Amino acid sequence: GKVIPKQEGLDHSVDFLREGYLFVANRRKSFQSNIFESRLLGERVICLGGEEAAEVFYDANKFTRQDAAPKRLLKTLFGEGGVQTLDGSEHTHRKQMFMSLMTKENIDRLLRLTYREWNQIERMGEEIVLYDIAQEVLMKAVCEWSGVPLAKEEVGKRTEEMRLLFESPTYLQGRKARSSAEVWIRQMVKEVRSNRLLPNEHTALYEFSWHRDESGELLPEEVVAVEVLNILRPTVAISVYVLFTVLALHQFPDVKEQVERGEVSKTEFVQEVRRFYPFFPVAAARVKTDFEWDGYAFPEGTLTLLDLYGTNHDVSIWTEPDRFDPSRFKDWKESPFNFIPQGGGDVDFGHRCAGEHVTIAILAQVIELFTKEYAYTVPPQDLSYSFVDMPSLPKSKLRLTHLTRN
Ligand code: HEM
Numbered sequence: 001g002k003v004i005p006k007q008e009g010l011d012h013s014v015d016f017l018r019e020g021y022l023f024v025a026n027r028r029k030s031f032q033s034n035i036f037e038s039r040l041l042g043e044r045v046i047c048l049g050g051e052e053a054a055e056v057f058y059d060a061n062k063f064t065r066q067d068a069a070p071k072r073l074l075k076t077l078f079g080e081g082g083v084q085t086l087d088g089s090e091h092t093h094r095k096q097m098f099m100s101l102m103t104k105e106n107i108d109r110l111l112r113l114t115y116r117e118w119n120q121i122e123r124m125g126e127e128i129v130l131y132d133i134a135q136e137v138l139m140k141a142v143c144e145w146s147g148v149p150l151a152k153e154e155v156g157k158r159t160e161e162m163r164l165l166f167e168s169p170t171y172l173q174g175r176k177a178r179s180s181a182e183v184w185i186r187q188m189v190k191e192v193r194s195n196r197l198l199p200n201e202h203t204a205l206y207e208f209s210w211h212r213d214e215s216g217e218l219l220p221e222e223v224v225a226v227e228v229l230n231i232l233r234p235t236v237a238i239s240v241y242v243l244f245t246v247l248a249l250h251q252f253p254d255v256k257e258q259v260e261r262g263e264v265s266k267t268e269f270v271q272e273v274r275r276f277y278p279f280f281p282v283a284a285a286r287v288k289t290d291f292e293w294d295g296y297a298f299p300e301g302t303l304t305l306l307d308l309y310g311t312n313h314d315v316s317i318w319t320e321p322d323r324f325d326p327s328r329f330k331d332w333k334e335s336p337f338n339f340i341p342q343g344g345g346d347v348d349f350g351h352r353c354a355g356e357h358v359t360i361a362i363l364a365q366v367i368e369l370f371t372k373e374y375a376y377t378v379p380p381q382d383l384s385y386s387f388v389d390m391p392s393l394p395k396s397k398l399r400l401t402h403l404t405r406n
C-alpha cells in the first residue's frame with residue numbers, strides 16, 4: 001500500500017529534454033525509488049528502473065505495447081504497423097519472421113559484406129571522419145545483405161535518410177525521409193511480388209515481401225516497406241556504437257592491450273561498450289489492466305517507461321558501473337532483465353531487439369579492424385559526448401588521420 005513518488009508541476013517534457021539519459025536516473029536517486037511518476041506528452045507517465053521493474057515491464061500479462069509508442073516516433077523513427085506495434089500471436093509470428101534472418105549463416109553473409117566495404121576505407125585517405133564512413137559502409141553492406149538495390153550515385157542520399165531517421169523543423173525533415181524511404185522500398189516490394197525483381201532467399205526484402213501472416217496471407221506493401229526499414233535503419237545506426245567502440249579503444253589503452261593479448265574477448269569488450277555508453281534511453285509500454293507490484297498500484301492505460309541506460313548503470317546490479325571493465329562479463333551470464341541496452345526479456349516471445357547478434361558481430365569485427373588491420377592517429381579533438389542530448393555522439397565524430405594498413 002504505497003504511493004508512487006510524484007513530481008509536482010503540470011508538464012515535465014521540458015525536463016526530459018533538459019536531462020536526457022539522466023532524467024530517470026536523477027529521479028530514481030532523488031526519490032530513492034525504482035519507480036516514480038511524471039507528466040509528459042500530455043499524460044501521466046510511470047517511470048521504472050532496475051532488474052525487478054524490468055522483469056515486470058516485460059511481463060506480457062501486465063503490459064502491452066498496443067498504442068505504447070508515441071505517434072511521432074511512429075511518424076519518424078519506427079514506422080506504422082511494424083513489429084513494434086504488435087500483440088500476442090500476431091507479434092510472435094512476425095517476430096519469428098525477423099528472427100529467421102538472424103541465423104549464423106545469414107549473419108556471416110552480412111559480415112562478409114561489411115568486411116568488403118570496410119576494406120575500402122583505405123581508399124579515402126589520410127583523413128577520415130569515422131561516423132560518415134561507418135554509415136556508408138553499413139548502408140551498402142545492409143542494402144546488399146537485404147537484396148535491396150542501391151546504386152552508387154544514390155548512396156549519400158539513402159544513407160543520409162537512414163541517419164535522419166535514427167537521429168529523429170528537423171522533426172519533419174525526419175518525416176520526409178521516412179516517406180521517401182518507404183516508397184522506395186514499397187516500389188521494390190511490388191516489383192518482387194510481380195517478378196520484375198528477384199532478390200535472393202534468406203534476404204529481408206525477399207522473405208518479407210513473401211511473408212504469410214498467421215492467416216496464410218501476404219502483408220500490405222507499406223507494412224513490408226516498414227519491416228525492411230526496421231532492418232536498414234538500425235543497421236546504419238550501429239555507426240554510433242562504431243564511434244563509441246573506437247573511442248573506447250583510444251580512451252582505455254589498458255583494456256585495448258588486454259583485448260590484443262586475448263585476456264578479454266572481443267564480445268566482452270562489445271558488451272561493455274553497450275553497457276557503458278548511452279544510446280537507447282527508455283523502452284515504452286502501457287499497463288494492460290489495474291495491477292499491483294511491490295505495493296504500488298499501476299492503473300490501466302498508464303504509459304510506462306523502462307530506463308535502459310539507467311538500469312545498465314545500476315549500482316545494485318553492477319560493481320563500479322562507472323568503470324569501463326569488460327572483465328565484468330567473464331565469466332558472467334546476464335539475466336534477460338539486468339543488462340538491457342537493446343531491450344530486455346525473451347527475444348522470440350517479447351519485444352526485445354531483433355538485431356543484437358548483428359550489432360555484436362559488426363562491432364567485434366570493428367575491434368579487429370581497428371586494432372589489428374589498420375593503424376591510425378587520433379589528433380587532438382573533442383571526443384566528449386553528451387549525457388543529455390539524444391542520441392549521444394562524440395562531438396568530433398571521430399576524426400582519424402594517417403590511416404594505413406598494418
Ligand atoms: C542491425 C541492427 C538492428 C536491428 C536489425 C534491430 C531490430 C530491431 C527490431 C525489429 C526491434 C523491434 C522488436 C520487437 O518489436 O519485438 C528492435 C527494438 C529495439 N532495438 Fe534494435 N535493431 C538493431 C540495432 C539496435 C541498436 C544499435 C540499438 C541501440 C541501443 C537497439 C536497441 C533496441 C531497443 C532498445 C529496442 C526496443 C526494446 C523494447 O521495445 O522492449 N537496436 N530492434
Ligand SMILES: CCCCCCCCCCCCCC(=O)O
Pocket residue numbers: 073077165166167168233234237279280281282283284390391
Ligand atoms: C521513446 C524512445 C526515445 C528514443 C529517442 C532517441 C533516439 C535514440 C535511439 C536510436 C536507436 C536506433 C535504433 C532504431 O533505428 O530503431
